[PDB]
Each structure stands twice: as C-alpha cells, then as structure tokens.
UniProtKB/TrEMBL annotation, chains A, B:
Stretches assigned to the Rhodanese domain: 483-565
Xref: Gene3D superfamilies: FAD/NAD(P)-binding domain, Rhodanese-like domain
Alphabetic keyword roster: FAD, Flavoprotein, Nucleotide-binding, Oxidoreductase, Redox-active center
Entry similarity comment: Belongs to the class-III pyridine nucleotide-disulfide oxidoreductase family.
Residues annotated as binding FAD: A11, G12, E33, R34, N42, C43, V81, S112, R134, D303, A321, Y446
InterPro entries, per the entry: FAD-bd_OxRdtase (IPR050260), FAD/NAD-bd_sf (IPR036188), FAD/NAD-binding_dom (IPR023753), FAD/NAD-linked_Rdtase_dimer_sf (IPR016156), Pyr_nucl-diS_OxRdtase_dimer (IPR004099), Rhodanese-like_dom (IPR001763), Rhodanese-like_dom_sf (IPR036873)
Name of the protein described by the UniProt record: FAD-dependent pyridine nucleotide-disulphide oxidoreductase
A Pfam cross-reference name: Pyr_redox_dim
Gene Ontology terms, MF aspect: nucleotide binding; oxidoreductase activity
Amino acid sequence: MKKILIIGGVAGGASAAARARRLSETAEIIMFERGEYVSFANCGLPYHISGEIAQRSALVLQTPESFKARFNVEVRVKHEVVAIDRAAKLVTVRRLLDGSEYQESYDTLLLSPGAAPIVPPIPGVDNPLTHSLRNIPDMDRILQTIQMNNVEHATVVGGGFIGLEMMESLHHLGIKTTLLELADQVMTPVDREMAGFAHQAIRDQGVDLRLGTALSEVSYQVQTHVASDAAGEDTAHQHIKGHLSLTLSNGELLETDLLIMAIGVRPETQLARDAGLAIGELGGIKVNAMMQTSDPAIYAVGDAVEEQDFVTGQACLVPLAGPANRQGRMAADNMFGREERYQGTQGTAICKVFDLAVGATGKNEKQLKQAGIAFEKVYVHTASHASYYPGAEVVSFKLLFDPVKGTIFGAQAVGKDGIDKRIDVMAVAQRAGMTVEQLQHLELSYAPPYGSAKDVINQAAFVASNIIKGDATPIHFDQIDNLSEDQLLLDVRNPGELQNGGLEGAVNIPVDELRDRMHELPKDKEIIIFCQVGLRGNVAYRQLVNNGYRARNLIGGYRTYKFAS
Amino acid sequence: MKKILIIGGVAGGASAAARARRLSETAEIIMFERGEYVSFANCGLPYHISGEIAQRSALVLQTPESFKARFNVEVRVKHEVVAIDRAAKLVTVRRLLDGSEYQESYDTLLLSPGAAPIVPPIPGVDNPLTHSLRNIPDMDRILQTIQMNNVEHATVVGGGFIGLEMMESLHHLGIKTTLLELADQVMTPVDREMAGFAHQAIRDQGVDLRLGTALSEVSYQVQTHVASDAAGEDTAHQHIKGHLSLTLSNGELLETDLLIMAIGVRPETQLARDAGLAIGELGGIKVNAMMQTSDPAIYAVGDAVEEQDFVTGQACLVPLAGPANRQGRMAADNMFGREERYQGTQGTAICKVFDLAVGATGKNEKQLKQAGIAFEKVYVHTASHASYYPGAEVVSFKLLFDPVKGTIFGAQAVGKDGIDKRIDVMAVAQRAGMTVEQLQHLELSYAPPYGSAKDVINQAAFVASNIIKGDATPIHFDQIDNLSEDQLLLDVRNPGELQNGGLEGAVNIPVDELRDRMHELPKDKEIIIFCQVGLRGNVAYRQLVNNGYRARNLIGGYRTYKFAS
Ligand SMILES: Cc1cc2nc3c(=O)[nH]c(=O)nc-3n(C[C@H](O)[C@H](O)[C@H](O)COP(=O)(O)OP(=O)(O)OC[C@H]3O[C@@H](n4cnc5c(N)ncnc54)[C@H](O)[C@@H]3O)c2cc1C
Ligand SMILES: Cc1cc2nc3c(=O)[nH]c(=O)nc-3n(C[C@H](O)[C@H](O)[C@H](O)COP(=O)(O)OP(=O)(O)OC[C@H]3O[C@@H](n4cnc5c(N)ncnc54)[C@H](O)[C@@H]3O)c2cc1C
Ligand SMILES: CC(C)(COP(=O)(O)OP(=O)(O)OC[C@H]1O[C@@H](n2cnc3c(N)ncnc32)[C@H](O)[C@@H]1OP(=O)(O)O)[C@@H](O)C(=O)NCCC(=O)NCCS
Ligand SMILES: CC(C)(COP(=O)(O)OP(=O)(O)OC[C@H]1O[C@@H](n2cnc3c(N)ncnc32)[C@H](O)[C@@H]1OP(=O)(O)O)[C@@H](O)C(=O)NCCC(=O)NCCS
Ligand SMILES: [Cl-]
Ligand SMILES: [Cl-]
C-alpha cells in the first residue's frame, strides 16, 4: 500500500488527494495545510470583499471532515512542513497551535505550496494599513482595516489581475481609489494598444490611474487625536488607526487611508532549496513533463513550478487555477505509475474590468519581439452578435501569427460581451495546431441572439489570410505618423465622421464616391488608406490596387490608432 | 472583361457579388432578385414580428443603389430568371412589372435561389388565415392578419427552428399558442432526452405543446356577423377576418384565429432540373467541393444545394446562413480560377427557447444508429461558471464518440447560460480532428464571472476517457428500468433528496456513509449505482470496484433519466 503525503491543500494538492483515492482504496493519504482551510476559492476573495459574493461560507468547498467521510483522506490543518529529509524519506512538520514538531514517513511526496506575494524593498512598507491578498485571513485583515480606519481613499499598486480586482472591489464599496503601475499599461498579457480600452474604462469610473509611476517610500503616521462628538467636532471622516503618506518616483506626495500591494507572486521554493531539489532560472521548482522534481519520489505542481510555454517550449511562470487543478490530478495518476505527460501552458486568461472583459491566450507582441520570433498582426472590431438584434457590443480583437506558415502565436480580445467565447475558440484552435488559413473555415453557432453569419474569428482569419496571400498590404498605427514624400494619406470615411478625430493632412474621398472620383489621386504616389475600423479601407484598397496603384490599408483603422495613444 | 450573372441576391448571391468585385474592377457583375429586397436579414424576421427588433429598417443591410455605389454591381429587383440555355450561355429573364422577357449572356453563372417552405397535402390548407415565413412580404402578411383578425389564439405546426421562433414571438405578443409536431420532439438536431429540457420550458410558459401529432384537415369559416356596440354587444374578442377549425390525427378539433405552417424547406431546383443539371437523392442541386454544378461554367451554393456531411462524407441538407455566406465567397474565388475546396458541413446550430438555448454540432444518436456507426455517449450537468459567484446556470451537455478510437461524432447542450460557447468549442475541436483523450487538455478562460477551474468541456472529456480506458462502466437511462436477478439497485443520494423522485426498489446508502456501510451489499451481485447527475455515483463506483465488486454508474444520473420521460 503506498503512503502518500501532500504539502498544501488547495488547487494542486486537494485535487491530487481526491483523484488518488479514486484510483486506490488501499493507499494511505495525508494532506498538510498550514492554514485553517482546505479547498477554498482563492479566486473569490476580492468578490467577497465587495459583497458581490454575499456569503463567507460559499468560499469553502471542502472541509477536513468532508475529505475524511468521502475520500478517507486524513487532512491536518494548522500543520506546516518545515523540512524534507530526502535520504530518510521523512518530513518534519510543526503544529502551529503549540510549536511542537514530529516526523512523518512517505513512499512519495507532492509539493503544492503555491506562490507568495512579492515583498518590495520599499522603505516603511511594513505597517498596519498596508496589506497583500492571498488567503482568507489576508481578506479578513483587509476587511477589518476598511471598517476600523473608516477608509475613504485607498491606493492599489500593480495593474495585474489581482490589482484590478481589488481596485474594482474598493470602488464597489464607495471608496475613492488610485491605481499605480510602473509599466506603461495594466494587464501585461495584452499589448499596450489593447490595454488602452481598459485605461479609458478605468478613468470613466473616476479612478485616479497613474501609469509609468513607482511608489518610492511609505510613511505611516499614527493617529494621536481622537475627535469626538462630546468635543463638538465632526467625526465622520476621521481615521483612528492612522494615515499613509506616500512618495512617488517623480517626487509627488499621495495621501491615503489604505494601501494594497498587488505587484505579483513568487514561487514557494524554500523547502525545495533546503532539500537540494533543482530550481529553474525563473526561481520556480524545475519539473519534467510527468511533474517529477530532481528526486523521482517527489512531485510538484501549481504556482510553485516552472512550466513549458506551449508556443515556444521555453520555461515560463503562469500562476493560474486551471493548470494547477489538472496538474494535481495528473501527478496522482503518475504516482500510481501511469506515466502521463503534461502538454505545456498557453497562459489562457481573462479579467473583469468594470463593464469590459480583457482576455488573451498564447504570446503577445512584446514576448515575440523580445524572443526574435518574426510575426505579423491583425485587428478587427466586429459586433459580438448580429448587429440588427439588440445588445450587440464591439469585440476588439487581436491575432498574432507567422506571416508565412500561418502558425497561430496568440490572441487578445476586449469588449463588453462574448470575449470569454472568442478566447476559448482561439485557445482550442491553437492547441489543436490549426493555422490562420484553416481558421477561415470555422462553422460556429449562429442565431441572432448569440452570434453572426461570419464570426469575429472568421473576419480576423480572412483579414490575416489576405495579408499572407498578398491580396492586402498593411500599415500599422505606429507607422502612419511618419510618412515620406512618395506617400499620399487618404481618409475614406464620410465627412461627418471627421469631427471625431482624424490624422493631420489627409485628403477626404468617401469610399462610396471613390470609383468615380479616382483620377483625383496621382498614380506616382503610394496611397495610404484608413477608415474607422479597417473594413471600408479594405474595399478602397482593392479598388486602387485593381487599377494599378501602389497602396496600403491601416489595419484596425482609426479606432486602433486612437486607443494606442 | 469576364461577364458574371448571379441569380439570388441574398446570403449566397450577395456574398459572391461583393467578393467578386474586390477580386476584379474590369468584370461585369449583374445580380437578379425576383423580389423587392437584396441582402435582407432572413433570421431577424420573427424578432421584428414580436417587436424585439423594433425597426423595420434594421432588416435591410444593402440596397440596389448601395451595391451600385460601393461595388459597381448592377442589381435588378423584380427580375426573375425563368430559364437557363447552357449550350448557348444565355438566361431568359422575366420582368415582373410587365411579364416581358429578354435574354442575357454570361461567361460564368451562380445559382443561389434558396429553398421554399414545404406544401403539405392537407385539405383546406390554402386560406387567408394561414401563412408560412420566408421573406419580408410573408412577414408583413403575418403582421397584417394578427392586427386585422385581432388574433388571440394561434396554432404553429412544426417544431424546428422557425416553428419554435414563431411560437416565442406570438407568446411575446400575449397571444395563446399551440405547437403541433408529428415527431416525439421539438428541435431534431438534439436527441429526445435533450429536447425534454425544452418541452418543459415551453409548457412552463403555458404553450399547449402536442407532440406525436399531425394536422389532418383545415376548415376556414368566413365571419358573417360583425358585432357592434350600437347593437349593445361585446366587441373585444371578435375576429372579422374569420375562424379556423382544425382536425388532428387523433380526431380532436382545434379552434384558432391564425395558423403558421413551419414544417421545413425544400431546395429550389426547377431552373436546374429544366437545364439538365444534376440533382442528388435528397432533391438538392448536386455540386463538387469547388461549388461547381454538372456544368463547369455554372456554380451553385446555399439552401438549394446538397452538401458533404463533415463526419461521414455523405450528402445532407442543412439550410443555414454561415455556410451559405462562406460558400458564395468561395464561389466568387473559383470563378476567377482560384480552385478552392469547401471542407464539409457539421450542422452547428443554436435556437433560443424562452430562457434556454438549445445547441448542437456534428451527428446525433438517431443519425448514428441509422447509419450503423458504433458510438458511446456521456452526459454532464455542470455549472456555466464558478457556482460560488452569482448567476451561474446548469449546462446539460451530451458528448457522442467512438468508444475505442475516441473520434468526436457530435455534441449537444441545453441551458440558461454559456451554450453558444460550449458548442463553438466542440465545433472547433471536431473540425480540427481532436479526440476525446485530447480534449482533457483544453486550457480555457477562467475568472469567476465567466468559467470554472475545470470547464463543462474538461468534465465531459474526463467522464468519457474514463469509459474508454475501463476506469468507469456505464449504464444508461434506457437500461436501468430492466435489471435481472444478478443486479442490485443502489441510490447514493442523501435521504432528503429521495423526496423529488427516484427509482422503485433502490437500496439507499448515501456516498459519504458508503465506505463504512459497505458490507451491507452482497458481493455476488453487480451493483447498479445512481445519484442526481452522475458525479457522486462515480465516487461510489470507484469505491466498490476498488474493493472487488462488479458495478455500473448511471451516466447523467437521475436528472438525465427524469427528462427522458
Ligand atoms: C485574489 C486572487 C485571485 C485569483 N484569481 C484567479 C482567477 O481568476 N483565475 C485563475 O485561473 N487563477 C486565479 N488566481 C490564482 C490561483 O489562486 C492559483 O494560481 C492556484 O490557486 C494555485 O494553486 P496552488 O496549489 O499552486 O497554490 P495555493 O492555492 O496557494 O495553495 C497552496 C497551499 O499550500 C499551503 N502551504 C504552503 N507551504 C506549506 C507548507 N510548507 N506546509 C503546509 N502547507 C503549506 C499554503 O498555505 C496554501 O494554502 C487568483 C489568486 C488570488 C490570490
Ligand atoms: C425565419 C427564418 C429564420 C432563420 N434563422 C436562421 C438562423 O438563426 N441561423 C441560420 O444559420 N440560418 C437561419 N435561417 C436560414 C438562412 O436564412 C438561409 O440558410 C440562407 O438565407 C440561405 O441563403 P440562400 O442564398 O441559399 O437563399 P435565400 O437567402 O433564400 O436567397 C435566395 C434569393 O433567391 C431568389 N430567387 C429564387 N429564384 C430566383 C430566380 N429564378 N430569379 C431571381 N431570383 C430568385 C429569392 O427570391 C431569394 O430572395 C433562417 C431562415 C428563415 C426563413
Ligand atoms: C474540488 C477539488 C477538491 C477536487 O475534487 P474532485 O472530486 O477531484 O473534483 P470535481 O468536483 O471537479 O469532480 C471531478 C471528478 O468527477 C468526475 N465527473 C465530473 N462530472 C461527472 C458526472 N456528471 N458524472 C460522472 N463523473 C463526473 C470526473 O471524471 C472526475 O473524476 P476523475 O478525475 O476520476 O476523472 C479541488 O479542485 C479543489 O479543492 N478545488 C478548490 C480549490 C481551488 O481550485 N482553488 C483555486 C482558485 S479558484
Ligand atoms: C453583406 C453582404 C452583402 C456581404 O458583403 P461583404 O462586403 O462581403 O461582407 P462583410 O461586411 O462581412 O465584409 C467582409 C470583408 O471585409 C474584410 N474585413 C472584415 N473586417 C475587416 C477589417 N476590420 N479590416 C480590413 N478588412 C476587414 C474581410 O476580409 C472581407 O473581405 P474579403 O472577403 O475580400 O476577405 C452579404 O453577406 C449579405 O447580403 N448579408 C445579409 C444577407 C444574409 O446573409 N442573410 C442571411 C441570414 S441572416
Ligand atoms: Cl471602416
Ligand atoms: Cl450526483
């Protein structure tokens, strides 16, 4: 009978524990968790903060006693593993209740410790008004400061998903908020010009967003003076637990009631470095594709481990829940000798940003420029369903691919509806190895409430494949401010549309009058075309090229240019 | 120049005509449409009847004048092609206004004439209160009877997509409705036990639904008496345009103010039969995969043409707008010599049924049995996003597959949320050639407002792969009422649930007490196991099989069984 020990009782480890029991009734299974709870909803925590998850009880999916009754697994809460002795096959655990220790033997071990929020070397950061959010007790501490310091202004630092969901939760509660990010964008899985849609939705809601900005120093000032109604002062905007004074990278001062630090997570590697297990160059535990670590008796999975990038095959860190549940179930397999291989990670993700969703899968343009992978890019801005049926919303969509083989590198989407469906389709298509050209032949669901005769994805294909075939020639948003004396700029929108914004120096010929009015444009210039989203631009480009003109169409049209600035 | 003539100015014909112009400015393009409108939204028609789509101008996407301006195509409204002389490369054209006819020559011709509603051989069916729905003027006639006949009760015949949409539209107007279907189910793209979810939701809204029934005779009675207020009569529930009395196949009479006939459509083939063109055994125009008919200078696409079934490679009839628009695009390519080949049709479809959507891709169980293909099926009933975040809904989902090769045959889903996204994923997965074993590694979008750590699709994959690998042994809803003396029925729900329905003779041991209570079950019988959905049943199965019992799990649990009756 195999004695199995599991370190961590959440997404990785709880999922191996239940799987391993279905596989064998004879094994001994013991799962350690240093916290009070197992199988809690990490992803739910900012939503319980704002009240959107009304019921604390809903964040707890399994208990020690339920794991015992259903799966016979002995789960020990408030028990922290403090060492692994590999030659002996024993682990030392500490009982947090009283600080005593004992040892336990294993036949095989699974490490599933996750990743801890990043500590930044900021003077004065460590203080009673400053918190990071990983678990339920972190959430209760945040709640308790909100109540007790009567929070009216708050600052979040970092524009990744945890930061944006804290920001949104704080705003749900009536709190005035400021978000700082050092980058020139929120959410880094999406490129800069796609993040612009998010920046404007965030500023439309009264949030003070400051990009390109760092937090230099934190000054915590204890409240010395308790105002009171018996002294006849105003006690409504009082903060009894103190005040934060922040210095920013540009010497400005920001006064605040609460600071939340959401600048990312680092893998939990201390038990593994202390036992001599291999660490990768990203600082995560190194595992083979069977999820085994340098020691064949020891497995690891989840936030703590490095994975293989699906597109490139290189190491990457991607702390998401999906991969961690399916890795733990596969480790349980392999611990009974199935020899199953995990198939790489795409980084499929999505985040709510007030009324928008922001979604992506595979590689963005920054990661491709930086690894020297040649690529091309397309944008469309296409209704989430038939436009003649109410509630349709613009889906802004980006597609990164190899301009020659048609390989799918990545996809990004942004809008108020149907983004979770476009990113799922592209995730499936890429994982199954489809190329752009094949994307053209997708037969998706169409009735008017749900979709359109040609889907967002079909239109993106045709635009990408037209470039690959040489039936289209592009000019991107970043090239169009910089024209040469051989290029003539041409706006093919209608004249009423021009008061929304255009580009300095365009001649205006509306697409519907172009055929007739053509001789107006000299054939000794490369005509550089744009419309609102790139579609009327394409029509104009075909008429010009069909009559012997040299031409280019701005992909994404003015809408992509305008959100990119 | 190449001279191109198109018959039909809707989904197939229009898409060819705009594409053909982006390919060539020197081509001559003429498109004939027998009616008043080109590029209308067929699919929006029932929704404008209900007022959903408020504006009669939202149904019109291009005009003759817009197609002249944008694409220099000459469109001729109220011109019907009445003959094709293939040998001469001339068509004969009748001018509606006049009845005058002329000839027009062509280098290449596209037939995209659509499919007309089926005429049933029913005595008295042709009358002023009875209509089917193909185009804008069909729609205007329906609205006009509704108004003029003060419609308070109506009958719809046929339970496919148009029937179900007209029934919803009429209910949305406060009209009492009856739906009659000869089959034992609405929506034949999904099997009978999936349609039961739809049967209940339609009777829940007070629609009088009569399955297994036909309409044998229609008797139309003019109204002789005009009730008047001056005569001191109630004028409120009068129908001055008359009354319908229907006789059904069981001999019952049905009294109604309006009859809608939605029993299917049949390809327009008369021009093609008259010209000598080949026609398949299903009665559609026969084409190769480049969209060319038995005459190489003549192309055909859309509702009029038999297609190649993706899964089996045989002929099928599938009148849907996605296919029609992409085929007409491709036909234009081919006419300029690109030799592109379509790739088969999956029959991806979705229909709104009150708050449910009912969707499907691939083959159903009916079509598999009939064609003698060996298959297996799984069911799952999984929350549409993390059920700890509000608004999550049950997605009932069926997967059809090859139990040894893992080939994906079909998928079906019904429920209040997220059905479009599940069906698009499976349509992507099957068109790309993925197997059920590969679906287990799908990495989808998860954030609590949208998805779950394991999606509906990961769960279905795991359940089916377990069967394929011999880790599960299924019994289905249609076998469980049998049972021999070698079999013993076990219900592993909690006692409290037996309250909502069960199976007679079951011995109740709840799964969380089963490990301890298990000596109660004798080893010399195969234990036949059931819970609500099949998830707890799986866990009970693994416990018994792991202790040397013979066992089966009821796949889909009691839920799937309940909705099959
Ligand atoms: C606020 C927030 C929102 C999130 N939103 C999403 C989302 O929307 N979508 C998504 O895909 N992902 C999301 N995630 C990330 C997701 O929570 C993780 O990626 C997944 O939980 C990783 O599982 P894990 O088992 O590796 O680690 P964890 O869930 O962190 O579990 C590890 C457990 O190990 C315990 N432990 C560590 N060391 C020891 C020790 N030595 N002895 C005993 N116990 C130990 C810890 O206390 C911890 O409870 C979110 C995370 C947070 C914090
Ligand atoms: C009420 C309704 C709801 C629908 N909903 C959906 C849905 O939700 N999803 C979906 O995928 N599909 C739906 N459809 C079906 C979809 O509309 C068809 O699949 C598609 O329009 C077929 O395109 P087509 O070009 O073959 O035919 P059509 O669009 O019917 O166009 C053919 C044209 O040919 C003309 N014509 C015929 N013969 C001649 C001739 N001799 N000379 C000149 N003109 C001629 C006709 O008058 C017609 O206007 C719906 C259809 C209806 C009727
Ligand atoms: C819940 C948890 C304990 C896993 O328990 P589990 O019993 O493996 O999980 P599920 O409820 O998902 O059940 C899956 C099993 O049911 C089976 N199944 C699912 N639906 C079924 C159905 N309708 N009929 C038959 N079997 C079904 C599956 O095949 C699977 O079993 P398998 O792995 O042996 O193939 C673990 O995921 C967890 O603790 N999650 C919460 C913590 C977390 O993930 N947080 C991350 C941040 S949100
Ligand atoms: C509208 C209709 C006339 C076709 O016109 P169309 O110009 O081909 O159609 P679209 O608007 O979808 O445009 C697609 C073209 O724009 C291009 N495109 C789409 N978005 C683009 C973008 N933002 N930038 C550059 N090009 C873009 C596509 O590549 C494509 O050109 P291509 O075929 O040469 O590759 C025909 O579809 C129709 O009449 N529809 C209504 C009738 C109907 O289908 N009803 C049946 C069921 S409701
Ligand atoms: Cl445009
Ligand atoms: Cl169940």
